[PDB]
Structure formats: C-alpha cells, structure tokens
Amino acid sequence: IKVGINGFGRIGRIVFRAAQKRSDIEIVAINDLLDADYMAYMLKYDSTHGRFDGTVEVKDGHLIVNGKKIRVTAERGPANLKWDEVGVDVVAEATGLFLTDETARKHITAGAKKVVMTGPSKDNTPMFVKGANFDKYAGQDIVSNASCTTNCLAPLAKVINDNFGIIEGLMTTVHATTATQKTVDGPSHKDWRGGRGASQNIIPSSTGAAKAVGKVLPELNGKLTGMAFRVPTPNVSVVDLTVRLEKAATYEQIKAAVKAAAEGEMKGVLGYTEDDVVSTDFNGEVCTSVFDAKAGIALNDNFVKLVSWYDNETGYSNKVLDLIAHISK
Numbered sequence: 001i002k003v004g005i006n007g008f009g010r011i012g013r014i015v016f017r018a019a020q021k022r023s024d025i026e027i028v029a030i031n032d033l034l035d036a037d038y039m040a041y042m043l044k045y046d047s048t049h050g051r052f053d054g055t056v057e058v059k060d061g062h063l064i065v066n067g068k069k070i071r072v073t074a075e076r077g078p079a080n081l082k083w084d085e086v087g088v089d090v091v092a093e094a095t096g097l098f099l100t101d102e103t104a105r106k107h108i109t110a111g112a113k114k115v116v117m118t119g120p121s122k123d124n125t126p127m128f129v130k131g132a133n134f135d136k137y138a139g140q141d142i143v144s145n146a147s148c149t150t151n152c153l154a155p156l157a158k159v160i161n162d163n164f165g166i167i168e169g170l171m172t173t174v175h176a177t178t179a180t181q182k183t184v185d186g187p188s189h190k191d192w193r194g195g196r197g198a199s200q201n202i203i204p205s206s207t208g209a210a211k212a213v214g215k216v217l218p219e220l221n222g223k224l225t226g227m228a229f230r231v232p233t234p235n236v237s238v239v240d241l242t243v244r245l246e247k248a249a250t251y252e253q254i255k256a257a258v259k260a261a262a263e264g265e266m267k268g269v270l271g272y273t274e275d276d277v278v279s280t281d282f283n284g285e286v287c288t289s290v291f292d293a294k295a296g297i298a299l300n301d302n303f304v305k306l307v308s309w310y311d312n313e314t315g316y317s318n319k320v321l322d323l324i325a326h327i328s329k
C-alpha cells in the first residue's frame with residue numbers, strides 16, 4: 001500500500017502516473033540523480049503520454065502531487081535510502097543497474113519489506129508475469145516482472161499451448177525506439193547496430209524474451225526463440241509469433257480461443273480486436289497483449305502466424321503494480 005521508487009526513467013515515471021489512478025497503492029518516496037524541480041518538469045510534461053493529469057509543486061525540496069507530499073532523495077548508495085523512515089513496504093527498483101539479488105537486497109537492508117525489479121533478472125531471482133505464473137508465487141522477498149516483450153508473449157503463448165499444444169515457435173518483435181538508441185550514428189560497443197541512428201534505420205537486435213518465457217512457463221522450455229527489429233516509432237510494439245501446433249486448429253478456432261481468454265480468465269491482461277488498428281491506436285493501452293485477429297495468417301491447420309500489440313511502457317508499468325499488490329496480499 002506504500003511504495004518507494006528508485007530511478008525516474010521512462011518506466012519509473014509511468015509507474016508513478018498509473019499509481020495515482022489506484023486505491024490500493026500510495027507512492028511516498030522517489031530516488032534519482034536529479035533535482036526536485038527537474039523531476040517535477042519531467043513528470044508534468046511528456047511527449048508520449050501528454051500533460052500530467054493533476055497538480056505538481058515543489059515545496060522545500062520535496063514534491064507535492066495532488067496534495068500528497070513525496071520525499072525526494074538522491075543518494076546512489078541504496079543502503080542509506082532510509083526506507084524505514086517514511087516506512088515503505090515494497091520498493092519498485094527501476095535503475096536497470098541492480099538486477100541482482102546481492103544489489104537489490106540493499107533495499108530491505110534499508111528498511112523496506114519487498115523488492116520488485118522492473119526488468120529481467122540476471123541471476124536466478126524468480127520472474128513473474130500476470131496470467132502466466134502469478135499463481136506460483138511462493139512468498140519471496142525479491143521478484144522480477146520480466147521484460148516488456150515477455151509480458152506480451154507469455155499470456156498469448158499460454159492460451160495457444162493449453163488449447164492446441166506448441167511443438168516449436170519462432171517470434172519476431174517489431175520494437176519501438178528506446179532510450180538506449182541514438183539520434184545520429186554514435187558509439188555503442190556492446191551492440192554495434194544499436195549505435196546507429198534510430199530515426200533512419202530498421203535495426204536488427206537480439207532479445208531474450210522468447211527463451212525467458214520458458215522459465216515462467218516451463219512447458220515451453222527450449223521450444224521458442226526470437227529476434228527483434230527496432231523501427232523509428234516513439235511507442236507501441238508488435239509481436240509476430242510463428243508456431244507449429246500438435247492438435248490441428250483452424251484460424252477461427254484460434255480466434256475463439258484467444259477471444260474466450262480475453263473475456264474470461266485473462267480479462268485486463270489479454271486483449272482482442274477485429275478492427276483495422278495501427279500502432280497509435282494502442283498508445284496508453286493497459287492490457288499487456290492485444291491479439292490482432294485480422295492481421296494473423298495461417299498456411300495450414302498446423303502452421304500459423306499470430307500477431308499481437310503491446311505498449312512497451314504503459315501496460316508493463318501497470319502490471320508491476322499488479323505484481324506489487326499481489327505480493328502484499
């Protein structure tokens with residue numbers, strides 16, 4: 001019910017905005033390498049999600065949003081974050097630098113009770129994706145909500161595998177531009193393609209989302225692998241999943257299966273549309289996976305190609321809040 005945010009990046013700020021529209025969660029503390037008046041500016045104005053729908057003021061180095069006061073730190077050593085001072089139960093860790101158990105444990109060292117990582121773990125801290133494996137949470141004090149792309153692929157793949165059985169799958173995501181790319185051709189020694197100008201290029205990139213699903217859904221372990229293309233669009237991405245099915249199924253049977261999940265057990269997580277949509281039509285979508293019925297194709301009853309959209313910022317942020325609420329129940 002009381003959360004602290006570490007890191008005010010794209011993910012951190014959208015997590016903050018989505019928390020305002022909720023009754024179960026109240027953010028009380030924020031940490032980043034930036035001043036308070038600057039954070040008030042970055043929260044007030046956004047090129048992708050418009051102006052902030054509320055009040056923001058700076059009073060004595062602290063933020064006041066909708067009348068509630070937020071404590072603003074800046075220390076880069078998580079041990080001295082004094083989480084117990086304002087007394088936070090869960091910490092949403094969005095630096096992208098402490099995706100390890102050793103580093104993340106500095107937070108509950110500082111007086112929090114649990115830690116949720118807004119990225120895929122690099123050790124073997126457990127991962128959880130809503131609709132995929134929230135059932136199997138076992139009370140751990142540090143968790144991960146996987147990647148933007150894994151939150152879109154896993155719910156769809158569970159529905160397809162449980163109805164028809166997946167023998168093998170290859171996926172490709174047409175991914176929107178992120179903060180790790182460059183405006184003009186620049187240096188990037190880990191990924192040479194990634195340093196090229198994002199505004200002018202289709203940039204192939206590797207991704208771990210397809211094999212990451214094998215851990216949140218052990219049934220498809222080693223049955224999927226994937227690849228990405230980064231394109232000059234500010235937001236919203238799309239997944240293209242090519243799979244072989246054990247049990248034969250027409251395309252209408254697949255539509256009906258997905259449609260039933262989106263209106264049934266996976267309402268709010270999985271979405272369904274039969275309209276002539278484009279990427280902008282999902283700017284601000286909350287579901288982490290919207291099936292596009294009309295864009296998929298089927299060669300035969302056992303070889304099919306499914307496409308599904310996701311807002312790589314909005315839907316992911318909303319689901320880490322659902323993960324925070326789920327681990328405090």
Ligand SMILES: [Ag+]
Binds near residue numbers: 286287
């Ligand atoms: Ag929806």
Ligand SMILES: [Ag+]
Binds near residue numbers: 286287
């Ligand atoms: Ag929704």
